[PDB]
Structure of Lysine-specific histone demethylase 1A:
Amino acid sequence: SGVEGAAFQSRLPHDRMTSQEAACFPDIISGPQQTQKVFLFIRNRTLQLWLDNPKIQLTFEATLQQLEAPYNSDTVLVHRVHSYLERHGLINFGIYKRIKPLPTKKTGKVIIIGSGVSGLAAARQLQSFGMDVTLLEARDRVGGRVATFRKGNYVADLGAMVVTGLGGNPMAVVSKQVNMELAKIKQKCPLYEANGQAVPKEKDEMVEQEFNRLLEATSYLSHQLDFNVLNNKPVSLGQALEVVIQLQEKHVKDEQIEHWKKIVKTQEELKELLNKMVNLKEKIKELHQQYKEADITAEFLVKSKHRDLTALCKEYDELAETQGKLEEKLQELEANPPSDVYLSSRDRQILDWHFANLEFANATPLSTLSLKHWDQDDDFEFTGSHLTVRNGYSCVPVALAEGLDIKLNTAVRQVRYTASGCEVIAVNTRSTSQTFIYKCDAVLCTLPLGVLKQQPPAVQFVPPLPEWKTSAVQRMGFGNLNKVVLCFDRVFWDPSVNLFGHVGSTTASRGELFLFWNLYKAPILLALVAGEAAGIMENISDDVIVGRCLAILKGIFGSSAVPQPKETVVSRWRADPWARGSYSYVAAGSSGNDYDLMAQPITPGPPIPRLFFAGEHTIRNYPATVHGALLSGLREAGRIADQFLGA
Ligand SMILES: Cc1cc2nc3c(=O)[nH]c(=O)nc-3n(C[C@H](O)[C@H](O)[C@H](O)COP(=O)(O)OP(=O)(O)OC[C@H]3O[C@@H](n4cnc5c(N)ncnc54)[C@H](O)[C@@H]3O)c2cc1C
Ligand SMILES: O=CCCc1cc(F)cc(F)c1OCc1ccccc1
């Protein structure tokens, strides 16, 4: 349906109130059911008006004018619902044409640290709400971990590049607003072994299905058998995977043992039977000779010796009847051995590609992921196919930056917060002698988790952050993932596949250049460096790592088919001082709850909150994504306005 679709697109149940709405509308939840349904229709229709045209501000008046009778008669309730949706960034978010120009006198000063998607999303909200907002950004550009390389006709994303399903995804709104060219990813992904040979289809399917089985077994271990703690330590996904593989190997060795036992027993029966048949020949050879050694006692002696001879001969033919039914049982047993091994050496390498793919998705070696919680956010996945941004994902933060007071090359060094306000201290990255002091009423920190983890600290908080916050910072995972960009003047790969895989020769290096992406107008290939390889490869110069790419590609397509690239770029996110990694993951011994702790604002001791937090590491249901960063900025903007302008 139409207004039901609007609730779904806003990640809301179309036919009941959320807890958040119950808090804000307690008179509605406690009142008659009929009025609750009116509430839900006003809410849903208001979201639909916005989602149907997110390029213009949806005002209260225009909401009222487009509601049909009887709904356009309860002016007060319509206003209450519009205001709530607006305050929480469910309408009039992103970048859109303002109908009401900005209030000329501001109310409250907010310093936002970092001009990534989360800081930008919050900044636009707070500016719309009539506050004085300034973003301090250490880089010479906005976007943070959205970072697009552009040169000539080449476009390639070094950070985020994939939009997950559009159903429920706020990026569907921003896409319309910014005019992103999205293109669905084709799922075919042929694999090539380290020698460049294609993986045959049957081995590809067999190994993939085994990967799915192994992973489902860890989830059974975790969520049915509750094997999540061992020797007082949290079990990791990698650890659980090693256990389920050990049991598969045990199973192979057992069935092998059973099979050898069947062989041996059959051999022993034949050995015994032949020995018995041997003695029966000796017994018949002795009688057959006493049949030639030969009257009335003689005419009856032949009858008796022929009766005796041919009975042993019937005994012997019957034993040769069992002899065949045994050595034919032996013959098919030797021809039907069970498997020698669980995984052939090549099978294992292929299985390690699927593990590498998973270390890509989580940005970290599997031995670091929480067995119990590594996929705690699964239930919030959007619907629809995934897409890539053909024109470069930087179009989003560049569009969101329009009209904001953004200070580039301005690196925050110290954040001071008291019950009387805040001071942010920063230095000019092009001239670190120049120092700046920003006074404000509230600080919104969107620093990446990697920066918050840095010891000694990059940014100093005065007073120091509370232990409950720093230990959550310490527990949470912050992974790494890198990309080699190869720009050619000609397409030598299969233009109709967006993905192909390189199967590494060893487990430890399985994430090295394991996945290639064909996404762009110009002849560009992105290769991923995942897992353990991601951090280690940053120590390799561009030319050497490009050379290793070219060797892989020369193996797949032929040495003469691969020309030298015209431009190359290599990300080093861990070594990047303004990121120190790629994105959070649920580390063994962490949980979704640490994401809630990260989102919690700080209040100076006895008072009102001063220091606020946004960023991909602060949103439990959508971590490590652009949409989660965006949602987190909208959330903190609502919280800050509630504090400084009233709920
Ligand atoms: C390699 C890679 C691949 C990814 N794959 C995807 C994908 O395809 N799709 C997806 O949805 N997500 C993906 N992600 C994740 C997504 O890009 C991030 O989750 C999101 O961009 C983070 O936004 P943020 O605002 O939380 O942080 P950021 O974008 O990092 O914003 C923080 C900002 O603070 C700035 N800053 C740092 N230190 C200071 C300081 N001292 N003073 C001032 N400013 C400072 C930084 O420069 C930055 O601009 C990927 C990320 C990477 C790096
Ligand atoms: O390039 C960036 C990938 C990072 C990433 C981190 C997430 F936490 C969730 C994502 F959706 C995601 O991006 C697309 C993706 C989806 C599934 C598996 C792998 C990647």
